[PDB]
Amino acid sequence: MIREERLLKVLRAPHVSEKASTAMEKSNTIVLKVAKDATKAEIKAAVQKLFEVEVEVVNTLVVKGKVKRHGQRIGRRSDWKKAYVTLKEGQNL
Amino acid sequence: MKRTFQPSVLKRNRSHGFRARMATKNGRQVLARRRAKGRARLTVSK
Amino acid sequence: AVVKCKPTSPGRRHVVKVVNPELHKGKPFAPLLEKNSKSGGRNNNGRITTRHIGGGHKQAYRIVDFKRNKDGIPAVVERLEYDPNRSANIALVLYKDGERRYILAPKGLKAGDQIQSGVDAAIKPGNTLPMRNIPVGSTVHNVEMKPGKGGQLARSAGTYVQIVARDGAYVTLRLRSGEMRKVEADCRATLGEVGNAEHMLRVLGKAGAARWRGVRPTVRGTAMNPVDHPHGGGEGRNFGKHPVTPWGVQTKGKKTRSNKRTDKFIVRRRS
RNA sequence: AGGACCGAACCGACUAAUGUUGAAAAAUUAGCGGAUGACUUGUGGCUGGGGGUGAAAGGCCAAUCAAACCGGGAGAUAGCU
RNA sequence: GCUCGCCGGAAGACCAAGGGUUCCUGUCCAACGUUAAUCGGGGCAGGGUGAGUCGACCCCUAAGGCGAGGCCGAAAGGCGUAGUCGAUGGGAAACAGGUUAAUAUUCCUGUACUUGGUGUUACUGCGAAGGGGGGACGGAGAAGGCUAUGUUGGCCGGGCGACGGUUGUCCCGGUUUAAGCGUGUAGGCUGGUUUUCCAGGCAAAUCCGGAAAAUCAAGGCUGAGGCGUGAUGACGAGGCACUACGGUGCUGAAGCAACAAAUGCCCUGCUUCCAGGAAAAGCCUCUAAGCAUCAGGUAACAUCAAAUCGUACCCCAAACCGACACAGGUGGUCAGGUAGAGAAUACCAAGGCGCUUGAGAGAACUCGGGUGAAGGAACUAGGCAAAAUGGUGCCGUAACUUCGGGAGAAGGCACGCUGAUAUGUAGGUGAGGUCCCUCGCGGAUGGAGCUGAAAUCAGUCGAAGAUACCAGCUGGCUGCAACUGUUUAUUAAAAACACAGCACUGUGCAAACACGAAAGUGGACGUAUACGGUGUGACGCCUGCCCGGUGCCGGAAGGUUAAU
């Protein structure tokens, strides 16, 4: 099993957008920003054990950071990871 | 017209990359001069 | 059978083929084949060491039995095959215990023909046996120079070696060169002569034929600049020098043997 | 069948005109040669400087080649400007 | 938004490489954009890339790299065995439909498939850095069977028409459906089965190879496509209801046949030719050591797992390489209509564009073009440039020749449209029916239907019927080079280089020779019918004399002659 100390550090934020919103209200999927080194077994286990719901399957993409600039000083943001967590028929959050 | 720089990442790295500078005496001296000059990127890796 | 091609399209005007209807039209015997990668004339330093080599057709090596070690077991010649690595043809043979091997094909040898290696072999063409058992004045090919080593003399097509003497532990051999050489008499040799003599009668006809045997062009020395070849330069055709290699050593006469180790074994140089 | 014939792709580059502070540090337009072969091309690899490679022109080796580029000896030396 | 023009083997679509947010939405016009800009690949913010099946990673290897020991080398280091890496190659598996502003073989719907783990049950000999098979692989050519795809008819829905006619031999549109599973066909290959024996596959072997018999004449392997199912589902021209007029839902007819047909598939086939055409693993098998009522193997069922990284967007380009939003360069994939031999060319479809300065005027002159009286190379260094020729069929065709050519020599004639032969022929395809059955994806007959050259005769139109585009100028004498090729990237493509062929010469294998302080490597896993060097340069007739000089080869007597 995955230890609970690992399993708390994985989920990072709920992702709020309109693709996320239509995924919830149309296909049971909650979209959430996860740890960059988090595997699909860790995300599945962490939503099973931290929101106490039943997860059908996880799909993970990794989002690349945008090169912004302040003034005349550039900088890339930071890569993050986004997990499309497809729940079962019985869920709320 | 076909210019000289026809890029390929795999040849860039196999040729001038870090594992290929470290692979020999003189490339390690190259890295030593780039570190000593103090250089933001040593090799061309990415 | 040599055949002049009819002169449709130059390039075919001067070709003479050497066709052989008794060669096997088909794939060679597979577990006696191996990879033979082409080099380009270039050593482990990458450099061109032998010039004029490169390109040509892909070839697979055929392990030809030059040693002929299966003594006393007869072998029937299964077929004859084209070998790209040699001038001669190779015969695929089948021993009585179910082992196939390729040998160099001697002159008269056809399919369905008994050959036999060893000391008590009959003297007839195809039988490898030591030269203390071969009669003097017999044509013999695939000669060993050291006992047990493998054949190295008279392997190229239409080539034989005549045994002229048996003085003691040595046999004096008239090599195809014209050279008289002493060989130890325990060295095996195969009877007869090796058999594609008409190989020398083919004429190739065009430039691309040389190209497809892997022979790149030869730039002649006098066509170059002086930095390139000692012959070089000169305002139209201009030779004026004693003819040399590209490294300055005299061509046209100058003897380049220095061994001193194998001079014991040379009875008379060639002429 | 053919280093076969005509001819597109494809490779090339014979002529002319334009261009020549170009649209382009070598091209465009109209014709032109090869076009199953000694062809052409992709990806990778190997050869290195008095060295490579060269169907040979002193050609090519990163718009550089009768000896690359970078750094150093080095503020070479300059009865010359 | 309506018209107009351009590309349409691309100026459309999909990628690889390369780039790296340029993608999509809102917002701003300072600078960037060769002008203005409300617009933008610009600024700012937000959003966006979803995989057991696609690709990478992974398993295996080529060229080649690195390389424990090792051999070698003043040192650095060179080479290399075991090994280990290295794709551009070999290895398991997913398709259709729908959806987002922006992803989709990834999400959703439906239907699937693959490989491992574990468990149960039934049977059971399993077991390798080892043996065998297989993987496993050339160029060209030829058909045959198909399909993608298209055309026409039928069917279904809609229209009867701004200007003469248009209820019909009329017009517009649609007529689509996959993987998987089942069947096993047109082909292609091979005789099959049983028993005994063996100097081979380092050992063993029931596997492979081999040698005997005996019997049967068939079995096996492979294989496009079709057919059935998937699918009483989806999709579907269009209508219906609301309509932030952007669309959003609902409903939805027919959904067939004939012919033509690939450069795709059977085909890694078949025929043929020399120039003789990767490897290793997965895969199938054989056993050795061992384990043998255990482990393991096989089969069925159930259950679990299939991680990680890529996925946006451009990709013949305003996003890559060219300093530029540069008339240049850049690999693969798809490839509709009409005419055409065709991927040429013309005009078009799908789709995409109008090239990020415009408005005038209508001088010289320059550039790109059109036409030209009479003449017709007089131009000029030179017919440079332009003009001309140009297709298919048939007739016809010289010198010379290596007997192949020359030759498309040269030079001519025919060509549209309509009608008849013949309400479209010869030919191709071929239904229903009929006959037989080793009964079906069968063969024989039969010709409905579809497709359809080419020729002759008759007529008719125009100045002209290869009407556009496309598409040889021809002949005579001669120098050089035999020929195809190669070369001065960027003023020289040539008679120069190359070449087949010839000769001379070296080279006996630890070969000469070359790269290398050496080890070693190439020569070559070649062996004098071979290899290296040099010259000449197809072929034909030939290649004369000179060995005093320089070189080379040979000789050893004498003279001179180093280190010692």
Half-sphere exposure of C19 (CA within 13 A, CB side): 8
Nearest nucleotide by C1' from C198 CA? E529
Give the distance, in angstroms, between residue C74 CA and nucleotide E284 C1'.
34
Identity (one letter) of the amino acid at C15? V
Which chains are adjacent to chain A, needing at least 3 Cβ pairs under 8 Å?
none
Paired with C16 in beta bridges are C4
C-beta within 7 A of nucleic chain D, residues 180-239 of C: 205-209, 211-212, 216-217, 219, 223-229
Give the distance, in angstroms, between residue B1 CA and nucleotide E33 C1'.
26
List, as one string, the DSSP characters of chain C: -EEEPP-SSTTSSS-EEE--TTB--S---GGGEEE-----SB-TTS-B-SSSB------EEE-B-SS---BS-EEEEEEEE--TTSSS-EEEEEETTS-EEEEE-BSS--SS-EEEBSTT--SSTT-EEETTSSPTT-EEESEESSTTT-EEES-STT--EEEEE--TTEEEEE-TTS-EEEEETTSEEEES-BS-GGGGG----SHHHHHTTTB-----GGGS-TTTSSS---SSS---S--B-TTSPBPSS------SSSSTTEEE---
Of C58, C66, C53, C54, residue with least CA distance to C35 = C58
- The H or E element that residue A24 is part of is helix A18-27
List, as one string, the DSSP characters of C206-244: SHHHHHTTTB-----GGGS-TTTSSS---SSS---S--B
**What are the C-alpha distances in Å from A58 to residues A7, A13, A53, C245, C249?**
15, 16, 13, 75, 78
Q: Is the CB of B26 under 7 A from strand D?
A: no
Rounded Cα gap, residues A31 and A83, in angstroms:
6
Give the distance, in angstroms, between residue C29 CA and nucleotide E209 C1'.
13
CA-atom Rg of chain C in angstroms: 22
Nearest nucleotide by C1' from C12 CA? D2
Rounded Cα gap, residues A74 and A88, in angstroms:
44
Alpha-helical regions (H) of chain B: 9-16, 18-21, 25-37
Q: Give the determination technique.
A: cryo-EM
Give the distance, in angstroms, between residue A51 CA and nucleotide E345 C1'.
70
Write the CB contacts of A80 (distance below 8 Å, at least 6 apart in sequence).
Answer: A12, A33, A36, A62, A63, A65
Nearest nucleotide by C1' from C226 CA? D58
Written as six digits, the tokens of C64 are 């030809």
Nucleotides of D under 7 A from a protein CB: 1-4, 24, 26-27, 37-39, 43-48, 52-58, 62-63, 66-67
Nucleotides of E under 7 A from a protein CB: 17-21, 43-52, 62-66, 76-77, 79-80, 87, 100-102, 106-108, 132-134, 136-137, 198-201, 209-211, 273-279, 305-311, 320-322, 328-330, 402-405, 482-484, 490, 496-502, 504-516, 520-539, 550-554
CA angle C137, C139, C144 (to 5 degrees): 105
| Torsion angles phi and psi, residue C211, rounded to 5 | -70, -35
